């Protein structure tokens, strides 16, 4: 059923499933210590994760997979998905990262946390790439769905699993179809379509890199008792340990 949707139906479904933009818990009467900034970022991630699960359940076909496959894909992709959303929100704010509407940070503010400015610098560079490419919302939502389906898909031998894996690969192919259709509808030449498809998918190599660096950093913060983490984040983080 999900695999019978047209390109327009896929993009429409993804646009309609977009999660809300949440506020941080930032109290501007308090200064940005390392611990307070880490608490704001992790508390925001925790609240966004609930909405990410709602969003994932609206990605065509996702709820057709077993709960173990859904858990594994989200465990693999969660920080990539948070970060691509962050970069998207930051496009209209050169030099800043819009973690939330009340938490718009520049790289000097990132220095409040040991090791964070290096991550900020990569996220800021990725925001510049989005602006250079004039990334469109339709392309962004396709990329976010691709991350969800792809990041964990190789580390998946029963018949049911092979079935689930085939379903995922078929849906990834349908999202490719939808990206090309959007680009063609938008007037790109046939050569421009394949060139832009590649430029867009290479974004995902950089998103993966930043998620891995962020996960290492979060583990370091945890190991130094900088910030308490919710049980959810402890488990999400432990999936990468």
């Amino acid at each position: 059923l999900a695999l019978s949707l047209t390109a327009d139906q896929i993009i429409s479904a993804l646009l309609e499933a977009e999660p809300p933009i949440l506020y941080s818990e930032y109290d501007p009467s308090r200064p940005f210590s390392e611990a307070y900034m880490m608490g704001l970022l992790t508390n925001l991630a925790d609240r966004e994760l609930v909405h990410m699960i709602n969003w994932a359940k609206k990605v065509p076909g996702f709820v057709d997979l077993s709960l173990h496959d859904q858990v594994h894909l989200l465990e693999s992709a969660w920080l990539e998905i948070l970060m691509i959303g962050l970069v998207w929100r930051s496009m209209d704010h050169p030099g800043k990262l819009l973690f939330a509407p009340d938490l718009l940070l520049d790289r000097e503010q990132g220095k409040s946390v040991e090791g964070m400015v290096e991550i900020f610098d990569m996220l800021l560079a990725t925001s510049e790439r989005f602006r250079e490419m004039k990334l469109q919302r339709e392309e962004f939502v396709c990329l976010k769905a691709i991350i969800l389906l792809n990041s964990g898909v190789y580390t998946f031998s029963t018949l049911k699993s092979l079935e689930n894996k085939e379903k995922i690969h078929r849906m990834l192919d349908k999202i490719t179809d939808a990206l090309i259709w959007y680009m063609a509808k938008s007037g790109l030449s046939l050569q421009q379509q394949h060139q832009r498809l590649a430029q867009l998918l290479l974004i995902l190599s950089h998103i993966r890199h930043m998620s891995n660096k962020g996960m290492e950093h979060l583990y370091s913060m945890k190991s130094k008792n900088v910030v308490p983490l919710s049980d959810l984040l402890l488990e999400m983080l432990d999936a990468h340990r």
Binding site: I53, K57, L67, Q70, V71, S230, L232
Partner: peptide, 10 residues
């Protein structure tokens, strides 16, 4: 029982 597994049910 993982929190994530719980949230994927409701």
């Amino acid at each position: 029982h993982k929190i994530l597994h719980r949230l994927l049910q409701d």
